[PDB]
Amino acid sequence: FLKLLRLLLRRQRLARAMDSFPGPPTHWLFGHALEIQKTGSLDKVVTWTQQFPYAHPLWVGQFIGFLNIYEPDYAKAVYSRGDPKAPDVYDFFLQWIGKGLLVLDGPKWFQHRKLLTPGFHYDVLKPYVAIFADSTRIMLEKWEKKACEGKSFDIFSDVGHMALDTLMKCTFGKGDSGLNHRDSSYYVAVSELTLLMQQRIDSFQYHNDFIYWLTPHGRRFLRACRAAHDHTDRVIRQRKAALQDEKEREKIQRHLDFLDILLDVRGESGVQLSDTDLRAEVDTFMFAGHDTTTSGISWFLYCMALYPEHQQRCREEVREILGDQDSFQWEDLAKMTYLTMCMKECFRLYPPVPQVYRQLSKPVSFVDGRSLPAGSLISLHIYALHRNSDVWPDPEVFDPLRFSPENSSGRHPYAFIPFSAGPRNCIGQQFAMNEMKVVTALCLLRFEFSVDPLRLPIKLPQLVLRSKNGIHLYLKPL
Ligand code: HEM
Ligand SMILES: CCCCCCCC
Numbered sequence: 001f002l003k004l005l006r007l008l009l010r011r012q013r014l015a016r017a018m019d020s021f022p023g024p025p026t027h028w029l030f031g032h033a034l035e036i037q038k039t040g041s042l043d044k045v046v047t048w049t050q051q052f053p054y055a056h057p058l059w060v061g062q063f064i065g066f067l068n069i070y071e072p073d074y075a076k077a078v079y080s081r082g083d084p085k086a087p088d089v090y091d092f093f094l095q096w097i098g099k100g101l102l103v104l105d106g107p108k109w110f111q112h113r114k115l116l117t118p119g120f121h122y123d124v125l126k127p128y129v130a131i132f133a134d135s136t137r138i139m140l141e142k143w144e145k146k147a148c149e150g151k152s153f154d155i156f157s158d159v160g161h162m163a164l165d166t167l168m169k170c171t172f173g174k175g176d177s178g179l180n181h182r183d184s185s186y187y188v189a190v191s192e193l194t195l196l197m198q199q200r201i202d203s204f205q206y207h208n209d210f211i212y213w214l215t216p217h218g219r220r221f222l223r224a225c226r227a228a229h230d231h232t233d234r235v236i237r238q239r240k241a242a243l244q245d246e247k248e249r250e251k252i253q254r255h256l257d258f259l260d261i262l263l264d265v266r267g268e269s270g271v272q273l274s275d276t277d278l279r280a281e282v283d284t285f286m287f288a289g290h291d292t293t294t295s296g297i298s299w300f301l302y303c304m305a306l307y308p309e310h311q312q313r314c315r316e317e318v319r320e321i322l323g324d325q326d327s328f329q330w331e332d333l334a335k336m337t338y339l340t341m342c343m344k345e346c347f348r349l350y351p352p353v354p355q356v357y358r359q360l361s362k363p364v365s366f367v368d369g370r371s372l373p374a375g376s377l378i379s380l381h382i383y384a385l386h387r388n389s390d391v392w393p394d395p396e397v398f399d400p401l402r403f404s405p406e407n408s409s410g411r412h413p414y415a416f417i418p419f420s421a422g423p424r425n426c427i428g429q430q431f432a433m434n435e436m437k438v439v440t441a442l443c444l445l446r447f448e449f450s451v452d453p454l455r456l457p458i459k460l461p462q463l464v465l466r467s468k469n470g471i472h473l474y475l476k477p478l
Contacts, residue, residue, distance in 0.1 A: 007063060014065040014377065015057075020370045021067060023056035024048050031059025036202050039468065042354060042383050042459055045070075046395075049384040054368060058379055061204025064088050066357065066379035070388060073367040075421075076414040078358055078378050082423035086357035086377050088207070092197050095225045098276065100284030101427065111271050112281065113427070119171065119258040120431050126330040128170045128431070132438040133327045135166035138178070140446050147475035152452040154470030156298045159439075160187055163290040163297070166435065171258035171289065172282075173239040186231035190291060192224040194463040232282045239263065258285060285428075292352045293432045295464045298471045299350035300343055300440050302457060305449040305473050307398055314339045315448075318441040333437050341400040343436060347386075347418040349398060352464050354383035356420065382417060391415050447475040 027034055035044055048056055049070050058068040066086075069075060084105035093103050101112050118124070139162040146153055161179060164187055168174035196217060200206045212218040239259055243249045253266050261269065262278055273281070304311035317338045322328060358378040365371040372378075387395040391412065392402070401407060403416075419426035426432070443449075451473060458468040 011063050011065075013375065017372050017376045018057040018065060018067055021052070021055055021057055023052055023058070026059050026062070029062060030204070031062050031065075033060050033202055033204060036060070039458060039460075042461065045381055046384045046387050049381070049387070050389060053390075054366065054370075060202060061207070063204065064207070064377070066377040067372060068379040068381050068384075070381045070384035072385070072388075072391060072412040072414040075380060075385060075417065076412075077364050077366050078360070079380060079414070079417070079420060079424070080422040081362070081364070083358045083361050083378075085424075086359045086379075088359075088377065089201055089357045091209075092200050095222060096193050096197070096228060097283040097287055098280030100277075100280035100282075102284050102288060103280075109424075112277075113423075115269060115271055116258065116261060116281070116285075116427060118255065119261050120427060121255060122330075122430065124255045124257060125431060125434055128166075129328060129330045129333075129434065129438060131166055131169050132435050133442065135162050135169065136439045136442045138162070138165075140442065143447060143475060144477050147447060147477050152455065152472045152474045154472050155301060156294065156467065156471050157187075159298050160290065160294040162439070163294045163435070167286070167289045167293075168235065170431075171285070172235050173242060173257065173259050174235075175242075182231065182234070185227060186286075189224045189227035189231070190287060192220065193228060193287075194291065194466075196221045196224065198462045228283065228286075229279070232279055232286055235259075235286070236279065236282060289428055289431070291464045292428075293435055295350075295352040295466060296343075296347065296432065296436050297439055298467075299352070299457075299465065300346045300436065301443060301449050301473065302451065302471050303342065303346045303350065303398060304440075304444065305451045308448075308450070310342050310398075310400055311444060311449065314342055314440075315444040319445060322441075322445070328438055328441065330434070333434055336437050336441065338400065339437060339441060340433075341403040343433075343440070344403045344416065344418075345398055345400045348392070348402070348416060349386065349396070350459075350465060351382045351386055351418045353418070353420075354381070354461055354465050356380045356382065380420075382420075386416065386418075388415075446478060448478060450474045450476075 024032065024035070026032060035041055038044070045068065048068075054071045054074050055067050055069040058066045069078065085103060090103050097103065101109065101116060104112060139158055142158060161184065164183060165174075165179045168183075200212065200217070200221075206212045206215065206217060213222065240263065243252070243263070243265070252260055256265060259282070262273065262281055264273070304314065317336060321332050321335045357380070360372060360374050360376050360378065363371060363373045386392070389395050414421055419429040419432075455469055455472040457471050460466040460468045
């Protein structure tokens with residue numbers, strides 16, 4: 001009883017705050033869940049976006065109500081203020097990545113953010129360029145054999161194994177050994193975790209913790225959680241043991257990679273992390289550092305396939321930059337200006353993270369006079385934001401030149417936020433951008449990509465942006 005009364009009072013509170021915001025009709029039980037759970041609901045939200053300027057309410061089951069926002073001023077008003085993440089959504093992370101940097105709020109988040117930000121300084125990243133090329137070459141060898149077999153194949157999983165391996169070699173001290181059967185067990189568990197958690201987000205019956213853990217869904221989730229934790233436990237043990245080597249420990253001790261910072265080599269961290277805190281940050285970054293870039297690369301190579309003229313331009317840019325070099329140098333990534341424009345245009349139409357959430361700790365007033373109070377829930381729809389017609393002429397049209405120096409000089413700084421923005425932006429953005437430029441550059445020099453008209457990708461939200469049917473492409477070796 002006590003709890004049910006509070007539940008209805010919040011229900012009425014959240015609803016009243018959004019009364020100045022008209023929105024689509026709500027089912028009496030599911031709210032908007034039934035539209036959201038359909039294939040294509042990202043595009044149905046885009047249509048709601050045209051019917052309701054700026055923002056519109058959004059309900060999952062008549063108890064939780066978000067304000068879906070999709071206009072730059074509205075995005076800027078919230079995502080510049082470092083309000084906490086929406087606990088109704090991010091609490092589902094807890095059995096999986098825990099209270100790591102993505103879930104933390106408040107001054108503990110800033111401590112860890114201060115702690116981990118040196119791990120992604122460009123001097124730490126320069127050596128990673130060589131690792132990116134090695135791991136890509138391993139993937140491209142597999143691909144030259146499949147290609148000569150004549151059938152189209154899904155590239156997503158191969159890109160993921162490659163991304164996972166390159167993430168661990170770069171930021172977790174993995175040695176030259178490479179992928180092992182156990183690494184694929186981790187990869188498969190993330191699929192299950194992001195599948196199930198995305199469905200929990202859209203399924204209000206699964207919201208209550210007590211109930212969820214009794215369902216087959218929740219038990220499946222907790223089996224996957226343990227599988228992920230077995231992986232991160234080994235990676236941690238392995239690096240503590242490897243630092244017991246005299247040669248190795250002397251060597252590490254100017255700039256430290258991600259996992260060594262956490263392990264507080266050289267004592268300089270100035271913060272003491274619990275084992276819980278440590279594993280949560282490893283869980284968090286092991287996930288965020290490969291799931292996202294897998295989506296980005298895979299969707300990019302799809303966009304290059306859809307648009308061979310752009311693909312050929314990118315192929316010629318990177319070919320001139322490489323010359324007779326054995327491999328690209330960190331300095332070369334800046335010259336890939338046109339590849340970067342296509343990559344941004346890809347992320348506009350195919351954002352690797354299409355939706356994020358906040359819970360306002362303070363009120364906010366928007367550019368049109370409407371406002372919201374503290375305690376309300378914000379749903380940043382990056383997908384619709386990037387297709388906003390008031391901001392992007394011909395939104396569905398792929399045009400890399402949208403991101404030329406001239407055409408972006410007066411860009412609203414919150415129009416194109418695939419890595420978010422404000423204090424809770426992506427810590428890994430330049431790690432990711434660098435990885436993806438090196439991988440896709442080598443991909444284009446080695447293969448020419450075309451789509452499969454029989455198996456065109458369908459967009460599938462899954463925390464990051466996946467495909468219902470993979471990304472099946474045809475490859476020509478060169
Ligand atoms: C294509 C690449 C990437 C995309 C699209 C992406 C997207 C995002 C987004 C949208 C956020 C905000 C989270 C929210 O609003 O809830 C974010 C934050 C973050 N990303 Fe990424 N990310 C990328 C690459 C990376 C990489 C490479 C790593 C790890 C090495 C990573 C780790 C994280 C973490 C830990 C945060 C939280 C930072 C904080 O709260 O201070 N991301 N990312
Ligand atoms: C609720 C969706 C958030 C996904 C964040 C992923 C961070 C890279």
